[PDB]
Symmetry: D4
Subunit: 161 residues, 8 copies
Amino acid sequence: SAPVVGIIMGSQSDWETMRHADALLTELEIPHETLIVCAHRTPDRLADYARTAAERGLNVIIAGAGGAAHLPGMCAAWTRLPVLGVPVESRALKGMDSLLSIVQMPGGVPVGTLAIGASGAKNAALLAASILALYNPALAARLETWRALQTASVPNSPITE
Amino acid sequence: SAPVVGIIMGSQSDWETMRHADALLTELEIPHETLIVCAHRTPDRLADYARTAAERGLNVIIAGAGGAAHLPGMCAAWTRLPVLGVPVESRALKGMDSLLSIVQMPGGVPVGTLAIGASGAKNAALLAASILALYNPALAARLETWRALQTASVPNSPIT
Amino acid sequence: SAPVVGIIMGSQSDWETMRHADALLTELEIPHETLIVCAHRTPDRLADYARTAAERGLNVIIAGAGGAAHLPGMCAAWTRLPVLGVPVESRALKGMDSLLSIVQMPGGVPVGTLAIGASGAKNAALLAASILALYNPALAARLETWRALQTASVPNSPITE
Amino acid sequence: SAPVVGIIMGSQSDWETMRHADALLTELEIPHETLIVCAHRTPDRLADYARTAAERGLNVIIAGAGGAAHLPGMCAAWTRLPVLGVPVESRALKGMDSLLSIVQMPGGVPVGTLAIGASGAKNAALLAASILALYNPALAARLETWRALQTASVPNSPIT
Amino acid sequence: SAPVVGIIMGSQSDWETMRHADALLTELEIPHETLIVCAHRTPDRLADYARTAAERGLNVIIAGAGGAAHLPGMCAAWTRLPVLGVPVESRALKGMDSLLSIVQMPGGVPVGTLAIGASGAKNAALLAASILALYNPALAARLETWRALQTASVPNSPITE
Amino acid sequence: SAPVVGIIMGSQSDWETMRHADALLTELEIPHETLIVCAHRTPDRLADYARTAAERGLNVIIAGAGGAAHLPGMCAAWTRLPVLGVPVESRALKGMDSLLSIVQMPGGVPVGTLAIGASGAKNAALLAASILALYNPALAARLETWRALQTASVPNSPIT
Amino acid sequence: SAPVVGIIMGSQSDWETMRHADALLTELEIPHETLIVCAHRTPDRLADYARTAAERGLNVIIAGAGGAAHLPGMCAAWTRLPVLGVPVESRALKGMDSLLSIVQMPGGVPVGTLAIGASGAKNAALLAASILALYNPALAARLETWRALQTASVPNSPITE
Amino acid sequence: SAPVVGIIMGSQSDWETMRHADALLTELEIPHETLIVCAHRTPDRLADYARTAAERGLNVIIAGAGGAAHLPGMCAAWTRLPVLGVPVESRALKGMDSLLSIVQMPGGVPVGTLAIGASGAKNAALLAASILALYNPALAARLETWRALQTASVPNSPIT
Ligand SMILES: [Cl-]
Ligand SMILES: [Cl-]
Ligand SMILES: [Cl-]
Ligand SMILES: [Cl-]
């Protein structure tokens, strides 16, 4: 029941995107926590969250942010855990500022970055699941079933009417 | 000594970038294989490589490509393993084509994407290490040392 | 009656764009098939479709995809037929990710790329028609008539009221 | 020995790029002509070239241009033949201006667009070959060989 | 009464933008003609329009186009008159394809390019007026009055209520 | 011999670009002046230059600037003369900042914008010439000759 | 009561953005003036405003503009005061033209640039406040309280219902 | 001689850019400190530096970073002082990643951002000077002289 993934985001406005990560983890029966951590308004909260994540039993952090999106990178600065970053779509620049701010981490401090928006949030959860599946056989079986069903469920032709 | 990370790239020209991933894994003593697999020129080679990766004992795949960079995404299509993608810098568009081709995966098939170029290759290896460290205590300790040395080695002032 | 063009796309959401290719082929009386083939969820379906296209009698493949748009390029990897790619407009990046993912094929494996969106789909069908017209006199005459009528139908002045 | 593909470009400076199309067609023994035609400096030359291409026996036109790259689109305006466009890399904008000027054709007048630069020129020639192969069995066999050799020649591992 | 400026555009859809050029010329009492000329569907119409513009008494051409916007550049290829180009906003790429397709004319064949959209159309007309004013004293006086009034009409403070 | 075109630029570094405008005007025997005027470092110099241009007998101003390129727009703010703007290629952003800063003028104050770099400088001079040709028959004839020679001099095939 | 910050913008349309700077200054009890100054239509008004700002007692200028956004840079050309620039979002290019036109000032004439849009306007006011706080103890205390409250007010978790 | 401006940067490689800020402050005789602080490799060093800056007597912080450039924003998160950000030019994306990562701060935590590269570093120092000049009359006079000399030194015509 203890969380093994932490989903963090800077604002309530990010939840519309990050809820897709939350939903997927629940679907795959991966215990997790969901929190707001703002890199710019609560930097000490971030430092403490990231520093202590491993000792609290977290294995993966999924962090979403938009604009000058510093939350994933600063999380990775303080934790040795894998950090996955979700660029949240921004109003003016459509998430391009979010994307570049997250993915372009200089060498030495990684953030595994997913697509802009809801797709990225879903895939961050799936990527987290595939990491956890490496050392959890029951989850690995659930993930295999999930991927197989996704493949089997693709229609053969469009509805052209 | 059986590999647990696979590093794959589309061509010899990608090696100038992907060698940084190889060097990092060797530094952390993570057994790995380093191969050329081209999504466009050797698609069947890719299918076989990705489909069999898990049964061969690989845990993570690091895939580098430039331009219309399809290697990481198509690898992820055939494996349940985590796939990490490195956008190789392209001549004209400086890896922006590489980056968008890799990171903008549809929901359902993830690629964890790193920075354009050598930084991304180094970070893909470190991210692979941080994944393996979750279930390998000796490696977790070496990764802790690596990160601690990185932090401690930053100078306090520039040399003028 | 056997199809000589295959129109393929990754999702039902692509049909709003790809239907314009379908309509134009029908207008020019070019027999064709329309299918969903998702490069990422059904990669073996794609491999089989592309590998066997020539022996099935297809002459041209029109492939549409958005985002990390890999369907046209991977189709071309497996077929010796000409493959035409239509970038489908994406939500955040307005099809720029689609366009670059399709057009920037490194040397050795071509995809002839058309404009982002509905215009591109229509033109992929017209380009396919112009290819087929090289060795089909009746179609060449229909295409000539079509192009001539397009030219003759352009108004001389705008409705300025 | 009558040409069936026309390769046209706006200037001598484009030749560094378009020579890759020329070389590929020669390798596949596809008879072709290689000419300079500038949409902006020689518009009447372009009109005549494009309007008469089909009656001269051309089957495909490959057109390369950079910057405000109008040559492929205007060629397509005057011919019913398939026109393939190669964006030549520009000095400032690295061929992004070339690419958008060529690929964003209005519905009704297509240009099949290839990658920026030398890769695009090579691929325009290969795409022209794949078109001609549909109704030339000997060429189809040579193209099959070309693609098979490309696939088989990819090394399995990088040289370190 | 004979036209001294020609306003040309490729489609009726361009009129929503180009009407602002038309309105400004009329305001400044500059006789002009407004026509549809599509570079891609009616290339011979374009060649004839541009070739004969000077002998027909035109002094300036204002050409608007979007997407792969070739109309202004090809007009300039055939006329020695100054050609002013208006990038029409495009759906996916917001006129960036229009802008680059028009402004990036290689050396030897100029197009004086204005802003994307309605502002650009208005300014093309104003630029045309400033060209004509160099050798028409009555128009020069009207343009001076117009510019002076524009300056005098700027409010001193925003309505902040 | 009184100047009828003014070429202005913000710094000596712009001269590598703007010299192409100067050369073209000299070739067409259009009397002109070539000056440094910086919108940011010498704003009063700019105000005076632009406000007095018409009374000094200038007909067209060609203004080149890079980066946050404000020189053409601010020139146009103070003169009723046509102002043509040349985006100078910038180091980092390759003149895209220059281009947008110049071309995106608000309705009411036009700048006729040319291509990034040397091509734009040459074309600003040619556009100035085409404006002057409307009311100078001898110049119109020289411009006709210039354009005819440009067209006739394009080779028919590349040199291999 | 005399103003120590000037907020200037080129048009009434900019007020929807710049009002956020106005509101924040008022919240922090910083006396200020708000004016329209258009760099292109009223360049002499701009020259006079900027030249005389220091002698009028202003300490900081906040200037907002969109498109070819020259107002902040030209203000800085004429004043020795710090000038802060707010890129106003533009219709076609989403404020990217605004941003590059403001931030890319060559060396020698600075404009401190904030984010595109309302966030940038709010932050220009906050940056102005942090400048004034260096030599106004009462304001420094109000700003400290404001920043502390911002930090304390961040929720711990999203509303996930 | 106690520093009133802090110049910080993530690495030695940033010094080629940030030295221009250092030189300008020295020219205006503004006491300052120049340090390496990396947001990603030394985050605790950053937290301590920023949190204590005001109590140490700093008035302005100038922070330079490239790529995913987080140093200025995170500095601003911990200090009430004005923070000025310099986007360092990155290899692939020419500082566009640097620029967007720095300038697009959320409302509530400002970074005053300057141009990409050396120009931005020089201007961050000048902007810091203009801030300090508000409450230091001798410095205000030196800054007036600096700006006056800049203006007066612009040549009237290019050297050909
Ligand atoms: Cl290092
Ligand atoms: Cl090769
Ligand atoms: Cl030449
Ligand atoms: Cl200097």
